[PDB]
Design a protein around this nucleic acid. Structure first.
Ligand code: MG
Ligand code: ZN
Lengths: 168, 98, 48, 282, 49, 346, 96
DNA sequence: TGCATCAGAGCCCAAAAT
DNA sequence: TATAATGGGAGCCTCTGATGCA
């Protein structure tokens, strides 16, 4: 088939995971002694593919008679090494993180959608201020806390943990 | 032997030699990265009955368009008096071509 | 000289700080075998 | 500011529990709380304190923002914004227009707004961020690997601090450090100070930097390229040439046309084959 | 100027070494790491514009 | 806008402890741990599992997650079951739950009140390859370790014990994370010793030491070769994005050839070799061309044993070796006549 | 550069020149067979030493780099045919 | 609603870079 | 694993567009 069009679209976490051939779990790059890639690190052959054509890492299956085989011992697919230019990995974040293009490109796309100013979106994303998802009947300074309200740290603690003072 | 004519015993081109593009200045061998010879090379090696050498020709040659007369050579090995190289370097050769 | 202001103890020594490049007779430097020149820089004079 | 509720017998709640007026505290239901608050069970004073406070859900960071984005009903928001497009004030209509244009963008495309927040962060293939041994046996590597390493370290540490029940101050610091690290990987210098390698003022080169600019992928490798079968030399006037001619040095021409020359050297008997022909020109 | 910079870095190391170790037995040779100074000068001569 | 400034401001919102306040939190933390031990005994339940349920309820609904060591997934359903099992205890037993809860609470507070200590230690370790905030966070990790191991009975102030653990945590982080090529902590120790040693020798010798001078100073086991090898191992990579020139226009990586992908000439050459090889094999019989193809891996990629090629052609292991040898003999004969395959031997 | 046995840079402005001449095949050669089209450049060399005419070019490798670099930025770049169905320019190698 | 203030966007090519 | 130690550090153009104040 012939390429007539190029589409560009946002990528879901699902799609990013479907691209990925493995999760890079370690900051390691290559072994200081062997110079071979470190398992689960940024250069891992089990994830991004074999360094040498039709040869697994440990060298049990060395030729194209096995293509598609994944060495039980070393975990590497026997294919063309060209795949190390193609196959993507992924990092599974412990907390979601905003993609900065959709934050810092003005007017912010995230900000525009949620009716949040540049300063407000900054304050929530970079942990300067709380935003209320569910007031759960809270009230601060006599007025009820309304959903999507920004609270300072002092305001949130008084609401959430109560107000107290210690006098020497 | 045509290719090696102007190299001394140690592999450095002799002072006074005329060098032209493609000519060897300093001869060098490097150990072949481990590789399995392709079935074509297996068959070729089998046909001619000659063992594939362990080492490859990495020699320094005159680049395109350069060359002249060799006026100086400096050779520095490791473990000889007064000289210590950066880690891993056994020996360094410099060839001055005029 | 290292001094302990409390005790008064004084230990004094001449420490080696490494090397500083020397200028040759013609006003240049030799840095890793190659001759170098430090070019003067024009700029705004301090002041008011 | 808290309420004190004394108890003779066993207490059914425990310290740290959250409580609403009326929740049963101790003594099989006899003593219960009058206020919204956090339960403090005092075994010395034999009293259940309830510190006045709410169960409010308020969060920080991209997790909070991702939530508000997940809960967006874009159809509904289009309806509201169309009504806003009727308001007399130009600015009112203008702001609703810009908002409505982003809403419609997501609506037509089929993109979910929450995808602008990352859970899985992609990792570029290694050959595009290589670790290579140069001539001297030394290693040279792409800046992205250090940016990925910062990211991975902070993420892993975040997983560990979470597993160990660290205070919110520590978990919050890690999270803001985590956001900053993703930011550096994608567009370094975009927000905040550019992250640099130690003992250098040089900003590390991120994905945005690789893509854009005079040195970026588009202008450097895509709209222009270095090419084979090319050469350069000093020019000299050639009065004797016909208008359709140029003087071309033979040594240049032998290289520029070299493969053709190999074929021709085979047709005529100059070499047995192409391999021998190339070796002879070397 | 670069000398002054390397010296300031070396001074940072001195203050940092004046806390750790034994507050009693210390010489100037133990207190001074000259690497920051050497580096500042080496940087100026090789890599300056 | 400044993450360090912000963290310092957050740090400044928890007041420092009085000796009395410090002992109280430390005391409650120790007692809480003893309580968790007792609840394990009474219930026959995992102490770690108990600790996570207690800790889950103190920190609140905000943080609830699976812990790598726990056998059961930790979610509000399971933590309700276990919390309801603890609250199903008799009064004299159920009291340890209250003790444990207050222990975890005090742990949080104790950690929070000492955060400025970590900052004042971490600031001294900048410039070693970890960012200031990174050092603070690893330092904070050591502070957490210290709170769990602290024995308040010894009457030492908390800062004394913490400082050991915080210094330890920062140094481990630097040893673990500072290098693009990661090196084992013990090997980093050896490398650093070699640095100090060389620096001593240069400080006494008025010049950089040789490999041999370093080897004497390092004692027995060290010769010049090992000093060099250790320095070689310790070499850090340099950036591909390293600038060349005083314009911003070029990178170091742009000057590095690619040795992996075959060159057009190499690809061409290998292709011509396959075509000339097939040409020579057509001058044999199909069977003696097939025996060679099966034996050298040109077909299917594997080199078959004589027993396999022989069983496939219906002949004896000796016979297939024979038709292979006459094939190769004919091959050698045709080559001396036509000289076609000679040039590919380089 | 000469020291690296380099090629000449045929830059943005050089491309404009080929465009203004309408030399589409000359330009396409500059962009593929004479540069980063790996399959193409190999095939062109082999054809010339065999006397055949140079083959039709393939996808330039730096476009594949661009796609993967945009995937690293969490953007999905998809080459589509006239029916708006995906076309795989990685030839099955990067998809599970 | 009309006007400063600021953040972020750009600023020739090829050669070379010792 | 234990004297006590508790808040960092560097810094120097023009046009266009959005945003925050009369
Ligand atoms: Mg230029
Ligand atoms: Zn294997």
């Amino acid at each position: 088939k012939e390429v007539r069009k190029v589409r560009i679209a946002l990528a879901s976490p699902e799609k990013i995971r479907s691209w990925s051939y493995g999760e890079v779990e370690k900051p390691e790059t290559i072994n200081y002694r062997t110079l071979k890639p470190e398992r689960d690190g940024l250069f891992d052959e089990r994830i991004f593919g074999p360094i040498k054509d039709y040869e697994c890492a440990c060298g049990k299956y060395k030729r194209q008679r096995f293509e598609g085989k994944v060495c039980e011992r070393c975990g590497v697919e026997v294919t063309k090494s060209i795949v190390r230019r193609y196959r993507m990995g992924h990092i599974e974040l412990a907390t979601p993180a905003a993609h900065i293009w959709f934050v810092k490109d003005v007017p912010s796309k995230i900000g525009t959608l949620l009716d949040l100013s540049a300063t407000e979106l900054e304050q929530v994303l970079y942990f300067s201020k709380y935003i209320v998802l569910d007031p759960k009947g809270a009230i601060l300074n006599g007025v009820p806390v309304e959903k999507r309200q920004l609270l300072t740290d002092e305001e949130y603690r008084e609401l959430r943990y109560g107000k107290q003072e210690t006098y020497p | 032997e045509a290719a090696l004519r102007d190299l001394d015993e140690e592999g450095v081109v002799r002072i006074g030699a005329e060098v032209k593009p493609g000519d060897i200045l300093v001869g060098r061998t490097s150990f072949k990265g481990e590789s399995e010879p392709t079935p074509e090379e297996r068959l070729l090696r089998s046909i001619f009955g000659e063992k594939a050498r362990d080492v490859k020709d990495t020699s320094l040659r005159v680049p395109p368009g350069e060359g002249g007369i060799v006026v100086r050579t400096v050779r520095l090995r490791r473990g000889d008096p007064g000289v210590e190289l950066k880690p891993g370097v056994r020996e360094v050769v410099r060839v001055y071509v005029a | 000289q290292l001094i302990h202001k409390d005790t008064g103890l004084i230990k004094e020594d001449e420490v080696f700080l490494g090397h500083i490049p020397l200028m040759t007779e013609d006003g240049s430097f030799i840095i890793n075998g190659a001759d170098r020149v430090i070019v003067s820089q024009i700029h705004r004079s301090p002041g008011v | 500011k808290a309420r004190v509720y004394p108890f003779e017998d066993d207490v059914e709640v425990s310290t740290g529990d959250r409580v609403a007026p009326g929740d049963v505290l101790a003594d099989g239901g006899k003593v219960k709380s009058d206020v919204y608050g956090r339960v403090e069970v005092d075994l010395v004073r034999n009293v259940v304190r309830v510190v006045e406070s709410y169960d409010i859900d308020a969060r920080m960071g991209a997790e909070a923002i991702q939530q508000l984005l997940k809960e967006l009903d874009l159809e509904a928001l289009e309806k509201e914004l169309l009504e806003e497009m009727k308001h007399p004030s130009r600015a009112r209509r203008a702001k609703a227009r810009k908002r409505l244009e982003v809403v419609r963008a997501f609506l037509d495309s089929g993109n979910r707004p929450e995808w602008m927040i990352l859970e899985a962060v992609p990792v570029l293939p290694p050959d595009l961020r290589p670790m290579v041994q140069v001539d001297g046996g030394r290693f040279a590597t792409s800046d992205l690997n250090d940016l990925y390493r910062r990211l991975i370290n902070r993420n892993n540490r975040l997983k560990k601090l979470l597993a160990q029940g660290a205070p919110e101050i520590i978990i919050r610091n890690e999270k803001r450090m985590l956001q900053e690290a993703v930011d550096a990987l994608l567009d370094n210098g975009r927000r905040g100070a550019p992250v640099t390698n130690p003992g250098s003022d040089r900003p590390l080169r991120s994905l945005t930097d690789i893509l854009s600019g005079k040195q970026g992928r588009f202008r450097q490798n895509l709209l222009g390229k270095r090419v084979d079968y090319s050469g350069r030399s000093v020019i000299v006037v050639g009065p004797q040439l016909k208008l359709h001619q140029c003087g071309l040095p033979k040594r240049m021409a032998l290289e520029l046309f070299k493969p053709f020359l190999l074929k021709k050297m085979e047709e005529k008997g100059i070499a047995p084959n192409v391999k021998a022909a190339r070796r002879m020109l070397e | 100027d670069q000398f002054r910079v390397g010296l300031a870095r070396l001074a940072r190391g001195v203050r940092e070494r004046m806390l750790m170790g034994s507050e009693d037995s210390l010489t100037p040779a133990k207190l001074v790491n000259s690497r920051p100074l050497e580096a500042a000068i080496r940087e100026f001569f090789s890599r300056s514009q | 806008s400044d993450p360090v400034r912000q963290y310092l401001h957050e740090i400044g919102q928890v007041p420092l402890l009085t000796l009395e306040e410090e002992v109280e939190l430390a005391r409650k933390v120790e007692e809480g741990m003893e309580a968790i031990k007792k609840l394990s005994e009474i219930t026959g339940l995992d102490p770690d599992l108990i600790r996570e349920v207690v800790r889950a309820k103190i920190l609140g609904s905000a943080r609830v997650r699976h812990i790598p060591g726990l056998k059961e997934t930790l979610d509000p359903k399971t933590v309700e079951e276990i919390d309801q099992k603890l609250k199903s205890l008799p009064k004299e037993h159920k009291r340890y739950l209250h003790i444990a809860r207050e222990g975890e609470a005090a742990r949080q507070h104790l950690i929070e009140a000492n955060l400025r200590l970590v900052v004042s230690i971490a600031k001294k370790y900048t410039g070693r390859g970890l960012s200031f905030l990174d050092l603070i966070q690893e330092g904070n990790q050591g502070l957490i370790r210290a709170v769990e191991k602290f024995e308040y009975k010894r009457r030492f102030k908390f800062s004394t014990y913490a400082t050991w653990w915080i210094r330890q945590a920062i140094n481990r982080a630097i040893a673990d994370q500072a290098r693009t090529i990661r090196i084992p902590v013990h090997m980093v120790e050896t490398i650093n010793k070699l640095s100090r040693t060389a620096r001593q020798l240069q400080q006494e010798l008025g010049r950089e030491p040789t490999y041999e001078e370093i080897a004497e100073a390092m004692g027995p086991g060290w010769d010049a070769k090992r000093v060099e090898e250790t320095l070689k191992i310790a070499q850090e990579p340099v950036s591909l994005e390293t600038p060349i020139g005083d314009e911003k226009d070029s990178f170091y990586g742009d000057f590095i050839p690619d040795e992996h992908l075959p060159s057009p000439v190499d690809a061409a050459t290998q292709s011509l070799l396959s075509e000339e090889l097939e040409k020579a094999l057509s001058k044999l019989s199909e069977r003696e061309a097939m025996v060679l193809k099966l034996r050298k891996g040109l077909i299917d990629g594997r080199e078959h044993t004589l027993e396999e090629v022989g069983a496939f052609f219906g002949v004896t292991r000796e016979r297939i070796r024979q038709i292979e040898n006459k094939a190769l003999r004919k091959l050698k004969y045709h080559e001396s006549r036509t000289r076609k395959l000679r040039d590919f031997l380089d | 550069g000469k020291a690296q046995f380099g090629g000449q840079r045929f830059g943005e402005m050089e491309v404009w020149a080929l465009e203004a001449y309408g030399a589409a095949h000359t330009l396409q050669e500059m962009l593929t067979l004479k540069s980063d089209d790996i399959e193409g450049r190999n095939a062109a060399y082999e054809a010339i030493i065999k006397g055949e005419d140079v083959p039709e070019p393939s996808v330039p490798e730096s476009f594949r780099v661009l796609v993967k670099e945009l995937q690293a930025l969490a953007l999905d770049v998809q080459t589509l045919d006239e029916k708006d169905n995906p076309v795989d320019i990685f030839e099955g190698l990067a998809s599970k």
